[PDB]
Curated annotation (Swiss-Prot):
This is Bacteriophytochrome. A tetrapyrrole binds at residue 18. Signal peptide: none annotated. Residues 20-88 form the PAS domain. Changing residue 247 to A: 100-fold reduction of chromophore-binding activity. Photoreceptor which exists in two forms that are reversibly interconvertible by light: the R form that absorbs maximally in the red region of the spectrum and the FR form that absorbs maximally in the far-red region. Also has a slight blue shift for the far-red maximum. Could also absorb green light. May participate in regulating pigment synthesis like the carotenoid deinoxanthin which could protect the bacterium from intense visible light. It comes from Deinococcus radiodurans (strain ATCC 13939 / DSM 20539 / JCM 16871 / CCUG 27074 / LMG 4051 / NBRC 15346 / NCIMB 9279 / VKM B-1422 / R1). Contains one covalently linked tetrapyrrole chromophore. Lacks the cysteine conserved in plant phytochromes (at the position of Met-246) that binds chromophore. An engineered sequence used for X-ray crystallography forms a thioether link to biliverdin through Cys-18. The natural sequence can bind phycocyanobilin and phytochromobilin in vitro, but the identity of the natural chromophore is unknown. In the N-terminal section; belongs to the phytochrome family. Changing residue 276 to A: Binds PCB (in vitro), but has aberrant spectral properties. Residues 139-303 form the GAF domain.
């Protein structure tokens, strides 16, 4: 059973209670983007990340309580049609915005209950070839190797691993692609506690997460609770959600400035992760994340196929 989050008087997490951290409701985001929440009927803006006004070039007083009809006149009708009440929470509306103050932005929206969650961040054949390369891989080891090399080629990440969960939830690096000079993790195994049970559960439902800068302080949502419910805003489906500080510290101690993983899901179970590191902070472009999501699904399919052959 989850502890209350920090903003509802819950404890700071320690190694005795890793599994009790409510990582899905941190009430805060990473500073490389901005987040709004809005009422799913009216489009009234209900919450904003503290950086949202500055990030979007709006007056703080003007942004709170404004409507999406007024803020996003060109997207609001399409957004409503795309995300009706009761639609799957995983369903997304995506648009590219020409925003003079911030530049070209990627807008990603999903619905949870009666709330729309809007994520804004900057945005800037390969997919076909990568997809084909995974399919054409001859066995599981080769598939793992191709997956890591292909993801590294697409992303530029310093390290890309295939991290496989054992039945006891320990993990092992079973393939990696790595920059010259980096220590090998191939064949190394790690305790189950380093990716705790609630993280593993979340990663079965929401298939990509990241920390763009492992030193960056989280930016709170204001108000922190959804005014509709007087309860935490669900952020499991928001890539911008703040990462657990316990994990951020783990990464800093490894010399990792930026981290990203994609779930590999086989028979509805979390089989492993495509796990990526960069030494320097690094925001993987939105279009590249979409490509990785496609490759995660392809790898998942191919792991099942390869495991059936062998
Ligand atoms: C006492 C609790 C601790 C803890 C909790 C924790 N860890 C995560 C997320 C991840 N941990 C990962 C572990 C590894 N990455 C590696 O590269 C290696 C070894 C080579 C390991 C063992 C990974 C891959 C994740 C996924 C996230 C990512 O890809 O960056 C969470 C949940 C984080 C979040 O989503 O907010 C939590 C709560 N970690 C510990 O080390 C102990 C101290």
């Amino acid at each position: 059973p989850f502890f209350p989050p920090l903003y509802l008087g819950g404890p700071e997490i320690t190694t005795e209670n890793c599994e009790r951290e409510p990582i899905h409701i941190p009430g805060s985001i990473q500073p490389h983007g901005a987040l709004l929440t809005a009422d799913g009927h009216s489009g009234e803006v209900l919450q904003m990340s503290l950086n949202a006004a500055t990030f979007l070039g709006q007056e703080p007083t003007v942004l709170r309580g404004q409507t999406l009809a007024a803020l996003l006149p060109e997207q609001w009708p399409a957004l409503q049609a795309a995300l009706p009440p009761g639609c799957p929470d995983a369903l997304q509306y995506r648009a590219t915005l020409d925003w003079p103050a911030a530049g070209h932005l990627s807008l990603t929206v999903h619905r949870v209950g009666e709330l729309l969650i809007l994520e804004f961040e900057p945005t800037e054949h390969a997919l076909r070839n990568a997809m084909s390369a995974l399919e054409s891989a001859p066995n599981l080891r080769a598939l793992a190797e191709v997956a890591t090399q292909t993801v590294r080629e697409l992303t530029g990440f310093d390290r890309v691993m295939l991290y496989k969960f054992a039945p006891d939830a320990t993990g092992e690096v079973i393939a990696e692609a790595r920059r010259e000079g980096l220590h090998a993790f191939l064949g190394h195994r790690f305790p189950a506690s380093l990716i705790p049970a609630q993280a593993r559960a979340l990663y079965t439902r929401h298939l990509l997460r990241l920390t763009a800068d492992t030193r960056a302080a989280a930016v709170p949502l204001d108000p922190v609770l959804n005014p509709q419910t007087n309860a935490p805003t669900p952020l499991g489906g928001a890539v911008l959600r703040a990462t657990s500080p316990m994990h951020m510290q783990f990464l800093r101690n490894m010399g990792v400035g930026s981290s990203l993983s994609v779930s590999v899901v086989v028979g509805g179970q979390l089989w492993g992760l495509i796990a990526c590191h960069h030494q320097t902070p690094y925001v993987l472009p939105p279009d590249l994340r979409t490509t990785l999501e496609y490759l995660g699904r392809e790898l998942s399919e191919q792991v099942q196929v390869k495991e059936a052959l062998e």
